[PDB]
Amino acid sequence: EIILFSGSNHADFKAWGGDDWPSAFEISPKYEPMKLDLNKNFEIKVDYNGADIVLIFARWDKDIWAQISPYYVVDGTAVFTKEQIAKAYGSDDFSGLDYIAVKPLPSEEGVTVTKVSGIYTN
């Protein structure tokens, strides 16, 4: 396991159509370091409470916005697989990738995220 975040980030988000869709967690891998190696086979797990969430990968210059629903949710932990991300992204090659974020879908009380990690698979 590789920990990308633990703590408690809250994000509020009532509706699309406004100016800001905020992240409960996000990183910009062109600038910020991360131990997670996207060329290996991986899963991303997020511990959370509240609104349903999506995982986003985005590349600003191909206009790519891969947006993924959890593979499953048990015990307040969401799981996202490489295979899912790839399918949404168009490809399993992530060179050029600009943006990874965990975002809530529209709701009244928002979402709280306590942990974000990645796991390597065989």
Ligand X SMILES: OC[C@H]1O[C@@H](O)[C@H](O)[C@@H](O)[C@@H]1O[C@@H]1O[C@H](CO[C@H]2OC[C@@H](O)[C@H](O)[C@H]2O)[C@@H](O[C@@H]2O[C@H](CO[C@H]3OC[C@@H](O)[C@H](O)[C@H]3O)[C@@H](O[C@@H]3O[C@H](CO[C@H]4OC[C@@H](O)[C@H](O)[C@H]4O)[C@@H](O)[C@H](O)[C@H]3O)[C@H](O)[C@H]2O)[C@H](O)[C@H]1O
Cα separation of 122 and 118, whole Å?
Answer: 14
Residues within window 47-66 making contact with ligand X, judged by CB under 6 A = 60, 65
Q: Which is nearer to ligand X, 44 or 100 (CB)?
A: 100
Q: Which is nearer to ligand X, 20 or 32 (CB)?
A: 20
By CB under 6 A, is residue 16 in contact with ligand X?
yes
- C-beta of residue 67 within 8 angstroms of C-beta of residue 53: no
Q: Least Å distance between CB 40 and ligand X? A: 26
By CB under 6 A, is residue 67 in contact with ligand X?
yes
DSSP string, 45-89: EEEEEES-EEEEEEETTTTEEEEE--SEEETTEEEEEHHHHHHHH
- C-beta of residue 64 within 8 angstroms of C-beta of residue 48: no
- C-beta of residue 62 within 8 angstroms of C-beta of residue 24: no
**Which of 1, 20, 32, 75 is close enough to bind ligand X by CB under 6 A?**
20
Looking at beta carbons, which residue is closest to ligand X?
A: 17
Q: Which is nearer to ligand X, 40 or 62 (CB)?
A: 62
By CB under 6 A, is residue 17 in contact with ligand X?
yes
Pairing, β 64-68 against β 53-59: antiparallel
Q: Which is nearer to ligand X, 67 or 117 (CB)?
A: 67
